[model samples]
Target chain A: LMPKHIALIMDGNRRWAKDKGLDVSEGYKHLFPKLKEICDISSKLGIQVITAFAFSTENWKRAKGEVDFLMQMFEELYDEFSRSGVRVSIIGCKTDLPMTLQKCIALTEETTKGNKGLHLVIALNYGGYYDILQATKSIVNKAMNGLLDVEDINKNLFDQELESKCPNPDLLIRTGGDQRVSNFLLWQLAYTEFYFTKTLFPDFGEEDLKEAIINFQQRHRRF
Target chain B: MLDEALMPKHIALIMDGNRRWAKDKGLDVSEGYKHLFPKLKEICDISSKLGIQVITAFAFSTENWKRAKGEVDFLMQMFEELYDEFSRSGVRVSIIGCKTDLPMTLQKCIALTEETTKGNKGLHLVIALNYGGYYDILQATKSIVNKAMNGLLDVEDINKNLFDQELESKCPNPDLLIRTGGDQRVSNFLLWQLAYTEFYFTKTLFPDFGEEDLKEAIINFQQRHRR
Candidate 1:
């Protein structure tokens, strides 16, 4: 059996909202229910880990109003998941975020601290370049502390400092017609098979997830 | 092919289409080469300005000797003029190939150019004289193994970076590779060096390639997603 670790780049929220002639908030609202359904399915399927990119480092460059609204949405989502059994872990630096958003993240993490059913990872304010920089900093710090030799810094050591401690992603799926990796998990995806679809994230559900897995199963994995 | 903006650190160009350009212009092939020589210089100048440290131009392949002897002789003369021009321009030139197979005068010119620019801190210009990628890799491997046998290096140290050191230590893997004349294949230019290079293909012939053409290519490259 393949190791139960999957990562997703949930792209195309704004585009889907524009196409549907609805407010971007409506698209985000649609995502919450669909995401819940997918999580339930993944938990039942015995997949132990699921990491999703909730917001990118570049997303902060959007208009101020949109950024504020997205943060509000994230706070609401956290409140809903606070009582759920899913274990929620926020990957990326929390110190740089707005105080209110940081507090919400901390609360969500504390509330779901003991859940053992699913390892739900939300990559917010994450950048692959930032990940590499952090890993390099850890390696350099270890060397300075006499814990690790400079020559001992290899692929395995570098991997240990990456945000996702899970094994190399078995399959990486992207929604909304984008065919590029878009700076997600640069080092970890050395050999992962990619699945891209035209389906927008709001409309993406159990059938789309099943289709992606089915396609993954049919492909030969030489790696 | 990856996005164009993520240009490779070391780029190798075959520099084809000179003859085609000449044929189209109703002129001799030598005229086409003479026109293209200045363009080659232009590329080197731009590359230096852009902070590109290393570039290899495929001047002559091992198989080119099988062409008409007259054309071969003309090519040798062109190399002589080109070498003198490049030496005066202060571009550090390194001609990589089996030296024994080249004519005595050409070998002497290559040696003189190499000696003259040995101390220059500019772009490292590699001219592939009678070069083949597969042969280069095979020779590099043999050299590495020989060093290992003599206890100079370890087998465990063998990797992409190490392999690069064994081939040409000064250069990095290319970031963006551009092929003119609409060529789709790599043409065995730098097989191992271009393992993950972004490719840009254009139909522009060598003689007509100008600053605008180069800028357009770079603009296209800049739009690529580096990740």
Candidate 2:
């Protein structure tokens, strides 16, 4: 049973860079190509939705030089998204992001908006807790405005307010052996089958992704 | 490293593989039943001894109401017996399921636990009978809404800490979550609280789980470094 949606956390970029005697600035550059490889296979494998954890809200705690370069890289990101014909949807609070990055986000989303292939969801400045809190605020406002009844709030209704009303990920895979979700898709991954691998992001390629799927297929989802 | 020192203050147990173990051994379903409580009791005792404060055993769930044809009879019987025995045992059991439609005894089960299990004791054992994790979340938010709507606490006052205090989590996001029977999924157990919790998955059947099994699971948990 191939997962309909897959959530990917490409962890261990810094470690990968440190191990290879490379600058931390060059860390995870290899993953840029590797991710496209993954997306292509996931498309072939019939996985409809893929959410990639690019930058988290807490990532801003890093130094400006590193963070700005990371933001600087986003301009080149969606061109790759555009070339793949994969429809792009960015899920996260974008109001606080740099205008350049935001423009790129809008342009890329608009550029590949018509693509009918794999649905690639890049989570920029994403935090599951933050996303839920934002949804809760929207819901509370709705209640205050009489647009929603307090009694009318439910799981399904609450979901509509979430950034991605898309189906929650069925399988969540974390590269670099991290077992925790790292605050990726908390509410959405309530029942997600997690597959954590010791293979770092750059090392995790088509075979690893496919293997995770094979393992997921063998899994007995009691729920 | 999954030793007593690495123990989680709170631990959630999804007692899977009971039926699977029974099936593998060519045993009857009642064989699983026979071993369940004894196994559970063993866990509670061991957890308390290990300095683990809260022990939650997942019991009846929305699955109780779902049947894949010709299996309703099996599920129905299992549900009734589980409900009856928990009441008879009078263990501090908490039912987190929707109360929209429920057995009278289930309501009594809710009231029964509150009166009994609110103390610092050997182990604060909780059984999630007739529980649905989604419903638990919705109810928690609604409870928060109640105070917010009454103008007692403004919605502006809400934050992670506030929401946490409002949302009743079973335990402080379990430091280490160990699920026996080799299941990889959370299966909707404390969805919000498992944010950074380390997970330990095993193939050992629930009935086969004992003190040694727990130690091994803890050992597995201790091996990981948290983010």
Candidate 2 Cα outliers beyond 4 Å, as residue runs: A220-223, B1-3, B68-95, B99-101
Q: On residues A1-223, what C-alpha lDDT tens digit does candidate 1 reach at each position?
A: 4437677888788889988898887777766566667778888878787778888877888888888888878877685677768898988877778888899999899989999898888888886656655665555455446686544655567667788774767777778775555556655654455676879988788889888776666543311
Q: What share of the true interface contacts does each candidate keep?
A: 0.00, 0.59
Report the alpha-carbon TM-score of model 2 versus the true structure: 0.90
lDDT of 1 at B100: 77
Indicate the DockQ of the complex predicted as candidate 1. 0.02
Ten contiguous residues minimizing lDDT sum, candidate 2 chain B: B81-90
- Residue B24, model 1: Cα distance from true site in angstroms: 41
Q: What is the docking quality class of candidate 1?
A: incorrect
Report the lDDT of model 2 for residue B56. Answer: 70
Off by over 4 Å in 1: A1-3, A220-223, B1-227
Tens digit per residue, CA lDDT, model 2, A34-73: 7788889899988999999989988999888878888887
lDDT for A128 in candidate 2 is 81
